[PDB]
């Protein structure tokens, strides 16, 4: 699986236990040193962002290589696998450990390994079940917003409604004398004022109750493990169902199956097959991240509190009202039942191997895998809707097929020469292939609910053009590694690899990589008689690795269709082309030290790494005068340097008690070395960041000083200039030359985590914490809720009432008619400490199952996920983001009770 | 085991080896021009003038342009693979049109030099195609020079940025990074392309969808009027003004029927192809219209002032077509110029508000001729054409001396984005803070002061170069003092 | 939703 | 399947099956053909999905009463279900061999209407049979069945 | 679907939809019932050889 | 007609009380049919060879 | 094929 001198972190099955999410990488936030995992949505159909030893490139992806049982997969396919089938998870964060897997092995690989049946004479059955709820985890951002009449008085005073207008003249006949809108619709012209009050100036509408809910979560599973004299099997079926926390629907529901099987046919051949399948239903809330008027957390913060989405009985209405609108705005349940969507995906993973051992020593091994998924989605827009722009309805069907095949063949030969010189050779071949496909077809113009096939729409100007997409790639690799070992205390590993990809041109597709590593067992040679210490191994490595994750057709100079008339065709220039595109080459030096004391009762590991990346694939931004947005190129280089260290112990006292703890830490320092055009620095436009030589990608902002107490204007520091009294010079006119690079970082430098666990006679309690410090984020929601210049129709912060006037002069918030800039007062400290899980179990005593041979195990749980976070970021979530906090889906706080009957 | 993958639906980029390749690439060039010279790209320079005031519907989309928010306008807009909009999108689309026109012209010249065409009809057609490509190059370079280079009247600029044009790239080269050209080089390039392409194109028009000699004359007259040469503008405007007659209508209903029809309008010299499935777009930025069953309902984010409403007489045909009294269903006026065309609907009685792209009309040629006649002292041809144009549109003007021209050009070319250029070259300040809003729209369309006062000769009448240039090109001299 | 409110910053990483 | 034998005699048996097939076809008519009626080319893609599920559960109980009177009872349940689907989409008007995706055809009178078909059915059945047997030479079988169709 | 009295689309113009009568319908459709009598005889001779 | 097949039948006795089993198969198949036989076109089929 | 020749009998069973 990996070398002996490598950097391997193995996570056991108990940390991959029942977790009530489909995103399995979020269960590893804080369990591996160096590997940092951050997810950006509480969406059930969300996929985590993993980075091992910092970011390695700027254009290509820095995701690891996810491998489930030899053949390599993607995280969406892993999301349809039952997590109760996984035996362990090895993370190989080295250049000598990742030397037989290569497609993006410079980012590290993640080896998921599935469970196999133990070989007892009586098989094992296990029935798991669970049920829980999920809620929003933060409410503090809407604790300092305005109320209804307070916002109306603030708007009337600031001159938004009129130049000479009062509160009653605005609230009476301008935006409450808009029964003129509700009197145009037959469904609700007799409900205004009777059971439907859309504008209510006396209460405050709870907009959090109208946009977010409490969502259930269920899972069930049943597994049969067994094994006779030669064969072994693990079969399993189960289902998972998670509902969306937000009122805009986004669920996840899968029915799974798994059959791992292994057998020894004779004394010469051993065969095996581990094959799985799934039927899955996804849906995503695709409005989070954009700023629409009444949607998301931006909608729970900014909607005025004198607009009522509820009826008189407390239920959610079908429509609400915003002033100036020409049709009523639909709420999220009505918009969900008038725009249906349904997906259905069928996934199958077939995977098999055969080992042949002809002579003593060498074993040949052949392995082949197929990964097929057929997805089929449907969308509607329902006819005869009164609050729509048309009485006609539309429909759209889509069919996806993604097929990925793989073949891999090794031949290992191990031997000794005299007594203590054990060599091992390994040569091998690897071929990966992929071919995807998308077909789509829509229709529109339907007038009935029942008559809505695609062949029943209008046939004139209501026709449209279908959809078709094709993608494909391939990889071919030849590798060989050699392990030499002395008697007990010296191991030396040497490996060569040739990689060829389909993503690069025919003269640049092949690259050669190598790795040399070593391990020295100091305890078994020098200090073999000791009182306290019990293990000491030193290990070091150096190897070069490639990265080839850009896109499939990024090196051709292409010409596409662009039709002008309907009589002839027309061609346009599509891309620019780069004939000299090739791999990105990362050389990593590693040096570690792994101790151990009190015979297992203190383990400590310390690592050091460099990881220099050359010929870095940047999607370089061409100037706008070329007519192209960007183009992939091999220009630039960027360094890292880091330490990471973990230590675990056991501090129990009595026979009954069992107390253990673990701690885990990583720090690194990014550094860019060469950009792309002879440039010293490059600022990414309206993102807030900058790439500079000798620094990480820092933030690039103006510095906010305060306000001017004599006139009320905002003030910014002039960079570089110092006044005569030592103070820094300010100015009140904004310009783009007031911006400078500030000493923050987009990628956080310090990650870590720590775990505690106590036990008793049965009753056990485990608590896991994760933390990230050094993380800053631009709070983009505070641009909208803390400005008096524009967007006065929305709800504002409560601090915009002590604004600078001619009477109120000693204050801190500026005058009204000013737009704010994106400067250092919108940059916030998003450094958090979470409580990831708090599982409390109680395995039932073995004396309870005495005469009955039908049962023989039972456990219960009381699990709470994300129930505590400590940070100083005021934006519903510090983890859900990365460079900005837009209209975001916050994470979930979940309470789950389960049961397990093992019999 | 060979592994090389070529895309499905993409063809390689080859030099032209036949005539069908040349004709296909010319049609692709015209379809690229359709998405560039839109009314949706000239709404920003229309809102920046002194005609409009923001309503309470506006979600800070148009308000940087109306109220002159110079903190947003320094790096406004974006041009990336999910959105091309704003100042940056404007600067990107015309550079893309210039580059693909360069590729078409240079490959057709090399194909004419290498003799890959069989007979002489293909050589005559290829030379006419080359002339059309040169006209598209000149239009792209002029429309970039209009917004990103200073006038002769600006007071305070960046140090050494008053006599500079734009980055002039004459060949297809997607890796070129250079400095800005002088204004003399850019204007000599534009006028050289137009004067070299006029001689090849035939006199009569072949189609309204493609470039003719009338469009080259009309574009040259517009460029000469924007420069300041009135004799040459009156010379080039006379070759086309007597070929396209005005709309013959009796009341405003026939004017709205003939005007909104792209096919039955006898004034359009050049327009792009459009049908209900290809080449149509929705232009509801200024009027805010939305279909509701078989009616249209409006909710604009900006409405004109009271002097723009008071410009039009009540008997004018344009007071129900160009602007319309449909705010609050009967109470106020909006700019209703790009509403719809009734031939691009899906169902023939349900609006979808889809229009097409018009590139030049005859009313602008009339106004250029009257302006160049009143500035060179030839008064009978200034009183003939202005009285003919104002009588054909319903309300005839009485006295023709340089104040009826400004009012008639403001009345005719509303919505098209040609008022900022006028108030620069006619020396008019803003006075946004002194104008009166409409009295019927009280509570909906109120006043908001300018965030930056813009007197005569202010630097912010000329936009700033985007931030992707002057970060990738440190040789570029920027425009603004800030 | 409808009437997208503006002046947002783009997100790299 | 899964068999459970709680007491001597009766065996319960549960069985479940899924049958999925996803078919995907493509057809062309190649452009620039001299012996054709047009120089333009056409294309047509189709996606089929047929899913058929089944569940069946029996409970057999066999016994003797003295020495030579072996009875056997069997009751059972059967549920069959099927849901098929066809989606199709064509395009026409292509002028090149290389540029032949479905989103690259003409957009005027050269458009067409897609294809869509849906079929589904179900079956539910309750059955029971009884075998009686004498010592070696007499066997008598009796069975009842209730069938319900969609 | 052989027992419903159905109505399908049949469009005339491109502005409104149009319905036609598709099938006739039979509300009294049910199974087809086959009763089989069977009577056999199975011999064997020369201990398996016939 | 061209198919690639796979088959895994599996049976097991877990304990003295339960017996489980799973027989599961898969295939990747390519079909094509000559859809002119049965009709009388001018130069096709056995009617065309006659 | 083309120019279908005629007088065929329909086939039941």
PDB file of C-alpha atoms in Angstrom, chain B residues 1 39 114 179 222 274 300 340 355 390 414 429 433:
ATOM      1  CA  UNK B   1      -2.272   2.349 -27.292  1.00  0.00           C
ATOM      2  CA  UNK B  39     -28.438  48.513 -27.313  1.00  0.00           C
ATOM      3  CA  UNK B 114      -1.821  32.528 -52.791  1.00  0.00           C
ATOM      4  CA  UNK B 179       1.778  50.904 -25.158  1.00  0.00           C
ATOM      5  CA  UNK B 222     -20.441  60.273 -37.696  1.00  0.00           C
ATOM      6  CA  UNK B 274     -32.913  38.431 -35.962  1.00  0.00           C
ATOM      7  CA  UNK B 300     -38.309  50.991 -14.195  1.00  0.00           C
ATOM      8  CA  UNK B 340     -40.391  44.768 -28.479  1.00  0.00           C
ATOM      9  CA  UNK B 355     -35.847  43.163 -30.072  1.00  0.00           C
ATOM     10  CA  UNK B 390     -39.630  67.184 -37.686  1.00  0.00           C
ATOM     11  CA  UNK B 414     -32.883  59.204 -26.800  1.00  0.00           C
ATOM     12  CA  UNK B 429     -22.313  70.730 -17.390  1.00  0.00           C
ATOM     13  CA  UNK B 433     -28.890  68.728  -8.587  1.00  0.00           C
TER      14      UNK B 433
END
